Amino acid sequence: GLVPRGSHMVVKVGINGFGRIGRLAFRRIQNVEGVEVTRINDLTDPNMLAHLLKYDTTQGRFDGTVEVKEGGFEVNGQFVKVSAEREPANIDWATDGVEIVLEATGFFASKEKAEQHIHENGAKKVVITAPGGNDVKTVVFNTNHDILDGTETVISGASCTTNCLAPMAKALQDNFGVKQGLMTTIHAYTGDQMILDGPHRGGDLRRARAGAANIVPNSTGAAKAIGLVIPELNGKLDGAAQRVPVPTGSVTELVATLEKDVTVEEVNAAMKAAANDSYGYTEDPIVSSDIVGISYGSLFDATQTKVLTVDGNQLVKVVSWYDNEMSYTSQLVRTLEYFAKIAK
Amino acid sequence: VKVGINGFGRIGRLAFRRIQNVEGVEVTRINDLTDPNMLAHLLKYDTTQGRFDGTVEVKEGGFEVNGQFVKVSAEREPANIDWATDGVEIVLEATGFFASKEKAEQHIHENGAKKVVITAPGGNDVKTVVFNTNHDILDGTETVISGASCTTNCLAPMAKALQDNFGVKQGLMTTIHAYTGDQMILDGPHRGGDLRRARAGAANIVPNSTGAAKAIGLVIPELNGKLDGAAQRVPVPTGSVTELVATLEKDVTVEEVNAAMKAAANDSYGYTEDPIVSSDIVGISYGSLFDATQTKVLTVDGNQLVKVVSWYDNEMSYTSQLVRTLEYFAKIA
Amino acid sequence: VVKVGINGFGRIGRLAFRRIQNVEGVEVTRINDLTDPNMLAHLLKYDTTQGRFDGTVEVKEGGFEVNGQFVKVSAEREPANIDWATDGVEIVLEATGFFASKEKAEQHIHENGAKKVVITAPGGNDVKTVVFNTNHDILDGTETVISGASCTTNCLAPMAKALQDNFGVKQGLMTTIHAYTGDQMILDGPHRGGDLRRARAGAANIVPNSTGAAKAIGLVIPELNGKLDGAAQRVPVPTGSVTELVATLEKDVTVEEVNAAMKAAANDSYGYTEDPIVSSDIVGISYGSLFDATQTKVLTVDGNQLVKVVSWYDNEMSYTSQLVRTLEYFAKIAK
Amino acid sequence: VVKVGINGFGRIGRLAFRRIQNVEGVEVTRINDLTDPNMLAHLLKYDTTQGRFDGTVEVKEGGFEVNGQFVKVSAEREPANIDWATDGVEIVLEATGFFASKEKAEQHIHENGAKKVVITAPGGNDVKTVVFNTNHDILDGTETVISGASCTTNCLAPMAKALQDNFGVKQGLMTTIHAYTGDQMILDGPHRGGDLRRARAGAANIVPNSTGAAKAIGLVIPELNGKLDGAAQRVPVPTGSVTELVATLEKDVTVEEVNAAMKAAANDSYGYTEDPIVSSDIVGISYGSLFDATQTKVLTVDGNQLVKVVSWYDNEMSYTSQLVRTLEYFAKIA
Numbered sequence A: 001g002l003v004p005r006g007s008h009m010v011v012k013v014g015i016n017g018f019g020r021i022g023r024l025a026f027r028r029i030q031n032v033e034g035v036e037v038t039r040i041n042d043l044t045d046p047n048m049l050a051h052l053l054k055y056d057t058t059q060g061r062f063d064g065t066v067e068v069k070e071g072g073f074e075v076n077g078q079f080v081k082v083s084a085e086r087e088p089a090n091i092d093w094a095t096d097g098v099e100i101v102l103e104a105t106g107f108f109a110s111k112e113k114a115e116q117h118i119h120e121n122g123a124k125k126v127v128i129t130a131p132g133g134n135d136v137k138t139v140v141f142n143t144n145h146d147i148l149d150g151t152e153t154v155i156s157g158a159s160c161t162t163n164c165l166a167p168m169a170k171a172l173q174d175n176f177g178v179k180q181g182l183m184t185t186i187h188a189y190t191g192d193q194m195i196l197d198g199p200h201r202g203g204d205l206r207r208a209r210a211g212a213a214n215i216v217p218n219s220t221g222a223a224k225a226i227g228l229v230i231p232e233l234n235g236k237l238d239g240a241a242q243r244v245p246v247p248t249g250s251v252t253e254l255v256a257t258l259e260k261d262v263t264v265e266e267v268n269a270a271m272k273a274a275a276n277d278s279y280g281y282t283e284d285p286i287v288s289s290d291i292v293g294i295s296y297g298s299l300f301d302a303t304q305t306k307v308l309t310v311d312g313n314q315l316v317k318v319v320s321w322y323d324n325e326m327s328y329t330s331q332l333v334r335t336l337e338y339f340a341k342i343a344k
Numbered sequence B: 001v002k003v004g005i006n007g008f009g010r011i012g013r014l015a016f017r018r019i020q021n022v023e024g025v026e027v028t029r030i031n032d033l034t035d036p037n038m039l040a041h042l043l044k045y046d047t048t049q050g051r052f053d054g055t056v057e058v059k060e061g062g063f064e065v066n067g068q069f070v071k072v073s074a075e076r077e078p079a080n081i082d083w084a085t086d087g088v089e090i091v092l093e094a095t096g097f098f099a100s101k102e103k104a105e106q107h108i109h110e111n112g113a114k115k116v117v118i119t120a121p122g123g124n125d126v127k128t129v130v131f132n133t134n135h136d137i138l139d140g141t142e143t144v145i146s147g148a149s150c151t152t153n154c155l156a157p158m159a160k161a162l163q164d165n166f167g168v169k170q171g172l173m174t175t176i177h178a179y180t181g182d183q184m185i186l187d188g189p190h191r192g193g194d195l196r197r198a199r200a201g202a203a204n205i206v207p208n209s210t211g212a213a214k215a216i217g218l219v220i221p222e223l224n225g226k227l228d229g230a231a232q233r234v235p236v237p238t239g240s241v242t243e244l245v246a247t248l249e250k251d252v253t254v255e256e257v258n259a260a261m262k263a264a265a266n267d268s269y270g271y272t273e274d275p276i277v278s279s280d281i282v283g284i285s286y287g288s289l290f291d292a293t294q295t296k297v298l299t300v301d302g303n304q305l306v307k308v309v310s311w312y313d314n315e316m317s318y319t320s321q322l323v324r325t326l327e328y329f330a331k332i333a
Numbered sequence C: 001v002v003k004v005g006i007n008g009f010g011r012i013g014r015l016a017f018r019r020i021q022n023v024e025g026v027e028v029t030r031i032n033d034l035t036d037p038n039m040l041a042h043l044l045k046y047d048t049t050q051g052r053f054d055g056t057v058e059v060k061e062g063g064f065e066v067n068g069q070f071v072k073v074s075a076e077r078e079p080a081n082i083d084w085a086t087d088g089v090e091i092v093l094e095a096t097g098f099f100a101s102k103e104k105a106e107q108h109i110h111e112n113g114a115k116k117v118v119i120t121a122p123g124g125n126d127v128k129t130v131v132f133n134t135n136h137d138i139l140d141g142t143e144t145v146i147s148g149a150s151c152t153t154n155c156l157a158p159m160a161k162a163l164q165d166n167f168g169v170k171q172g173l174m175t176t177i178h179a180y181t182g183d184q185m186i187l188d189g190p191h192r193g194g195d196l197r198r199a200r201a202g203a204a205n206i207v208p209n210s211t212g213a214a215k216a217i218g219l220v221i222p223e224l225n226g227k228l229d230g231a232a233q234r235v236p237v238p239t240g241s242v243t244e245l246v247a248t249l250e251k252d253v254t255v256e257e258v259n260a261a262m263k264a265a266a267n268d269s270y271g272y273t274e275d276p277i278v279s280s281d282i283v284g285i286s287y288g289s290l291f292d293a294t295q296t297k298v299l300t301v302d303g304n305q306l307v308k309v310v311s312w313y314d315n316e317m318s319y320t321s322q323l324v325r326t327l328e329y330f331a332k333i334a335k
Numbered sequence D: 001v002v003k004v005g006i007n008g009f010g011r012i013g014r015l016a017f018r019r020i021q022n023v024e025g026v027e028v029t030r031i032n033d034l035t036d037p038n039m040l041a042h043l044l045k046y047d048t049t050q051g052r053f054d055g056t057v058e059v060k061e062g063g064f065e066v067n068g069q070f071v072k073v074s075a076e077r078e079p080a081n082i083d084w085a086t087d088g089v090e091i092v093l094e095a096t097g098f099f100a101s102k103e104k105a106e107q108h109i110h111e112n113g114a115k116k117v118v119i120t121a122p123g124g125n126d127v128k129t130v131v132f133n134t135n136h137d138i139l140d141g142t143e144t145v146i147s148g149a150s151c152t153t154n155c156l157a158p159m160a161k162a163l164q165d166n167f168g169v170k171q172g173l174m175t176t177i178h179a180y181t182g183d184q185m186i187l188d189g190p191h192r193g194g195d196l197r198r199a200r201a202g203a204a205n206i207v208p209n210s211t212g213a214a215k216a217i218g219l220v221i222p223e224l225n226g227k228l229d230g231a232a233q234r235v236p237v238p239t240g241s242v243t244e245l246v247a248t249l250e251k252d253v254t255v256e257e258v259n260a261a262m263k264a265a266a267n268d269s270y271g272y273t274e275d276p277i278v279s280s281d282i283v284g285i286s287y288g289s290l291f292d293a294t295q296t297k298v299l300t301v302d303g304n305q306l307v308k309v310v311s312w313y314d315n316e317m318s319y320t321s322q323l324v325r326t327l328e329y330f331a332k333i334a
């Protein structure tokens, strides 16, 4: 019943917030037939945004030409309009043919705030590049993108850590059954931390601290909110993060109790059988720099698996890598592409 | 004398720390953009400068430091700060947003402060003081003064020593500098339009401009227009070094240059012959620490290029100089 | 005064020396490494993570003076060839990382050598492994070689013992998010221990690696023998670490009850905090382990509970403080 | 099709191997280091600063296969004991850092050994020292041991040559703000070379240190012999560096005139940019030197000028690109 458009039917997309996720989403969209970005909105001039697209500390030089123009810039000869409108309600997305908006500022990550993009001369639909609350459909591609029918006005692409955790947790559930579990993500520092110790605008006394000079504990909702993606794991997981001095690249550990008894070999085999474009599998003893720029949402590491058996009881440890930037962005663009095709 | 701090940031908090050991000054009011709990926590725990030497306890509308209450406000406009309510005569303007005569003067009003010390360059019409180099230019009648920049407090005594001993014709400066709070933690839009400070500060060598060499005339009049320079910002969270390459009026040796610096040494200008690194100068009380191991004198066909190098903790070196100037200014006010 | 020797004037060796300056009745009279006195004196004076030395250090022939007092330096590669007795040394801190076994550490004990040795690391299952204020009562003074355990063991031990004593532990898994150390390469290159992860640039990566602390916990807390396992994620801070333990318990608990149990167990070795601190805040501390109540979790699902407890440690100074406490105690009961 | 050996499969050795995959007429048939094939294969596949290897690498007995082609690995500590000729090797890239002189590099040349050696570092004053596209014309092909110079020399040389040719150089001082390297300690500890600054934690400090690039420039540009000196400030980036030169010239100049001269000197080795870039932007580039027009200064005081010129270089890939250019040329004329 979905009657998806062909990739020859080009859907025009807008990006609100040309930041880490916005710029990398723009990069990946260059290699997607059927989606193209015609409007970028941020809080700055075209020259700043053009320069940040061209040159990228962790993700390398842009694959193509970028040239600044009046009110925008050209990417491989094709003009992209830039505006500097602080309020989503005041962005005229329809002027540039934009139907779907990537909401990637971090400031409008709810149904009510994201819907500000939807108005007369605005957009039709919004994909929030973050958790969007419990009343918004939350999609990890290749785990639950089949929940979309195309009539939705606002959807969520989840978080980076959710896209890492989801396929790993789903594999445990489907093969062995999960009773409960606790997650720790050892995570790259991100733009919501201070470069040096100073007052954090969100009131967080740990994100106030120098992000590239500390191990910084911090909260995450990924394990607690996993029910939005995998309903059968609702309320079964919790977790937190340890943010550390790498500029991108992260890893998720899950310690769980299962319904079935297992061996390390059986756990690793289950993950390998679950592998696809989104969920990767490796037995190489890699480190974080090796996963920067990958296209897997999640990369299971069979070298870190543990099964501890004591007096008939087992604790199981599973670990998956993710580039919080590109792994997430790859999933986001897979979801955007699919959503664009079935959109109604 | 009772002091106020506008901007309880890196310089503001370290200025508060040093003021705890200065008899003549005490802080009775802090103004920023946040609640007391945030500021108290940031005072207690410091990534580069260590745990606070004392007790800090959050109260309603402020916090107690070793039992003594300090009022906290969150007033965005200097004009709206009621400094006189807490007896404040002099304000340390340390936000980075009001570093000019006109903007700093907003602190001075009915129920406000009397005087302001800007913790940064403040323009050509504000007296710019490096303690132990030119603090004798103050008479105490000034409303707004400047404590200069971190790099100016490093450069000044070293350049002055070259001038007094050998005469300076011209020179170029490179400061290899710690990343600071005006850089982005990761690549993103820089609100000051700077395409290099837009970049991830702890993951790059980042070229950037500085006014210290160009504006040296404000501190050392005889060097006016003789120097220029720039910075290379690098991934350390504090601690910096200033290299000056200069032509001199007199011929010199490495040993004569080093001896001149040693003779110029005092509480502000230090001397070392130990092959140290940047972590070794974190938290020092010298404004400038000359390093004799890095001195060069290149003689080619009778002509000399002379290289002199001095360390500074852009945080604690500058803050020590700032508080010396504040103390002296408060006494003669 | 018990006279002590240090073999390996490295991170632990130099910080042990620093702490010994504030212990009356122990002094270092001999240092042995693989370099000249000028190199060692400079590394004592200046310290990237632990700050400038609190005192004067001046190089002399065959050693250096610390606050006017001479300390002899030698460059002897073989422990058997060190004449410790010449300088009155009875006990040696073996801190090279190369002689961490009973047979290798015993080489210090010979004619004109030392009497006893404290290995600054795990030393095998036939050497008594001591975490101060957890199990230092196992020492009688007649031992020749003992172990101060690892940094992670000194962090984990009092936290795990507190869980056991109050609630009973069935099993648990440990992750330590750990500062990079000197056994990692500064940039990608061949690792002489054959480790393909320690081969990688240690200050530019999250690096998984193994640890024996949870597996070997039975050596310190016999009732937890075989009940724990774990691993490490080494990350780009030059010192400062944290240990997370996820465990199942024999009793049902709340977050408040777990935190109260840790506070009641607090002493000179095991600290307690409710401040939301980060790794830089624990650099240079004297606690072997600093419990962080802000990170505690108790997840209850269908009547079953998983418990998370987390403790900070400066792998350098926290361990060194525990090491010196054990050294001092061992020295004064020595027979 | 000339067969090459690599002694020291390190940062320069592994990246040289990578570049050689895309050079027709040169191939590596032998690698020598101090470890097993599994360690070296892993280090080729995965690279912190330079990214994943573009190809398949599979470990075998006594070596590894790269895209199906076997490369022999040995663990011989002494250059004299390496049987290079067994695997057809004529030229050896000496990239260990331990045999960077004529006498020590010549140990590779014996019966059943190699014919020629290219030292991946300064090799002393009696070895021909080549920066490609600056002075590779000094080679005739009869040499047994040559040097590819240092990373800093390959950065400095084309920039200093352009100043000399256009304006004339009286004297100058160099500061290179340089990535930390494998000769520094990861944390504070005894430095085997006796250097009290390289003893310090390299990724947590600004570390002054010596360099020979400016002092030894005469080996590359004879007319600048004895005219320059310099030093380095090593800082916490794992690769990527920049060289500043402050100089007095024989002619008066403007900023525009200096930049135009550099642009006119640009080629495959010497790049030109006016973009305000940072160190991460030059990681993995193929220029030996990338002049940055945004950093140029000309200070005129009482008729006298000091001129500042600045060029970027990835001390790893920029140098390696130059090294492989010189190796390719040297192989063809041998």
Ligand SMILES: NC(=O)c1ccc[n+]([C@@H]2O[C@H](COP(=O)([O-])OP(=O)(O)OC[C@H]3O[C@@H](n4cnc5c(N)ncnc54)[C@H](O)[C@@H]3O)[C@@H](O)[C@H]2O)c1
Binding pocket: A016, A017, A018, A019, A020, A021, A022, A041, A042, A043, A085, A086, A087, A104, A105, A106, A107, A109, A129, A130, A158, A159, A160, A190, A191, A324, A325, A328, B187, B188, B189
């Ligand atoms: N960085 C990651 O690893 C990551 C991973 C997954 C999800 N996310 C999510 O993606 C979003 C963006 O994160 P990021 O790391 O790219 O942040 P960022 O700070 O790099 O990007 C935010 C951008 O939004 C712009 N912006 C802010 N307010 C705006 C406004 N009112 N109107 C227009 N533009 C505005 C900023 O100028 C900036 O360019 C957040 O919701 C974040 O949680 C980030």
Ligand SMILES: NC(=O)c1ccc[n+]([C@@H]2O[C@H](COP(=O)([O-])OP(=O)(O)OC[C@H]3O[C@@H](n4cnc5c(N)ncnc54)[C@H](O)[C@@H]3O)[C@@H](O)[C@H]2O)c1
Binding pocket: A197, A198, A199, B006, B007, B008, B009, B010, B011, B012, B031, B032, B033, B075, B076, B077, B094, B095, B096, B097, B099, B119, B120, B148, B149, B150, B180, B181, B314, B315, B318
């Ligand atoms: N950090 C250094 O190395 C250094 C050295 C010398 C001079 N300085 C100068 O000192 C000043 C502060 O630098 P910093 O590094 O401490 O900055 P910072 O960002 O650490 O501190 C700035 C503080 O000002 C507060 N603030 C901002 N706007 C405000 C307003 N309108 N009202 C009240 N408070 C406000 C912020 O909340 C923050 O706490 C600048 O002028 C800087 O150039 C800094």
Ligand SMILES: NC(=O)c1ccc[n+]([C@@H]2O[C@H](COP(=O)([O-])OP(=O)(O)OC[C@H]3O[C@@H](n4cnc5c(N)ncnc54)[C@H](O)[C@@H]3O)[C@@H](O)[C@H]2O)c1
Binding pocket: C007, C008, C009, C010, C011, C012, C013, C032, C033, C034, C076, C077, C078, C095, C096, C097, C098, C100, C120, C121, C149, C150, C151, C181, C182, C315, C316, C319, D188, D189, D190
């Ligand atoms: N660094 C930590 O966080 C930490 C914590 C707890 C335990 N440890 C343990 O302490 C030991 C030392 O660790 P470190 O970090 O201080 O290492 P390090 O590399 O800093 O110190 C080792 C020292 O031993 C010297 N040395 C090497 N071989 C020698 C020999 N044959 N004779 C004499 N001296 C020799 C080296 O020159 C160096 O000074 C190891 O067993 C380590 O596992 C380290």
Ligand SMILES: NC(=O)c1ccc[n+]([C@@H]2O[C@H](COP(=O)([O-])OP(=O)(O)OC[C@H]3O[C@@H](n4cnc5c(N)ncnc54)[C@H](O)[C@@H]3O)[C@@H](O)[C@H]2O)c1
Binding pocket: C188, C189, C190, D007, D008, D009, D010, D011, D012, D013, D032, D033, D034, D076, D077, D078, D095, D096, D097, D098, D100, D120, D121, D149, D150, D151, D181, D182, D315, D316, D319
């Ligand atoms: N890394 C740079 O930025 C750079 C730039 C230009 C030139 N260089 C020069 O290149 C050379 C190597 O530097 P690097 O950074 O690649 O060093 P590295 O330490 O990364 O590589 C050295 C390699 O040589 C091996 N080795 C050591 N002794 C050996 C022996 N006796 N026999 C065989 N193999 C041995 C080591 O195992 C290691 O793999 C040095 O001469 C250096 O000065 C380095």
Ligand SMILES: [Mg+2]
Binding pocket: A029, A030, A031, A032, A033, A034, A035, A036, A037
């Ligand atoms: Mg497209």
Ligand SMILES: [Mg+2]
Binding pocket: B019, B020, B021, B022, B023, B024, B025, B026, B027
């Ligand atoms: Mg006081």
Ligand SMILES: [Mg+2]
Binding pocket: C020, C021, C022, C023, C024, C025, C026, C027
């Ligand atoms: Mg003592």
Ligand SMILES: [Mg+2]
Binding pocket: D020, D021, D022, D023, D024, D025, D026, D027
């Ligand atoms: Mg080839």
